[PDB]
């Protein structure tokens, strides 16, 4: 009664789940990173060649 | 009182929820609207990249 049914906080966070959010830059951003990465390497490499 | 004639107790009223789906702005949800324009840019500095 004075801790679970007094207190604040619903113990359930099986109902009503995670709606749709849509997929983050921070998962992309490091295939940004190694896509310049590999252009930069191309140009050193086809510049020395 | 007499018999009861009808019958009732206590229900939920909720808001309804109809299918309020959009078009063509349902297309670009999934990743972004911003991350599109940057994946054109490094299509075309790219293609910039093989000419």
């Not at chain 1, 604040?8 to 709606?19: F, M, N, V, Y």
């Given at each position: 009664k004075w801790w679970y049914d007094k207190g604040?906080?619903?113990?359930?966070?099986?109902?009503?789940?995670?709606?749709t959010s849509a997929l983050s830059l921070s998962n992309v951003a490091g295939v940004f990173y190694i896509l310049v990465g590999g252009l930069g390497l191309a140009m050193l490499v086809a510049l020395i060649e | 009182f007499s018999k009861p004639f009808m019958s009732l107790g206590i229900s939920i009223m909720i808001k309804?929820?109809?299918?309020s789906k959009p078009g063509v702005?349902?297309?670009?949800?999934?990743?972004?609207?911003?991350?599109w324009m940057c994946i054109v840019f490094a299509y075309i500095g790219v293609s910039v990249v093989l000419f």
């Open positions: 604040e906080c619903g113990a359930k966070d099986s109902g009503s789940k995670e709606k | 309804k929820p109809q299918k702005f349902s297309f670009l949800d999934p990743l972004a609207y911003e991350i």
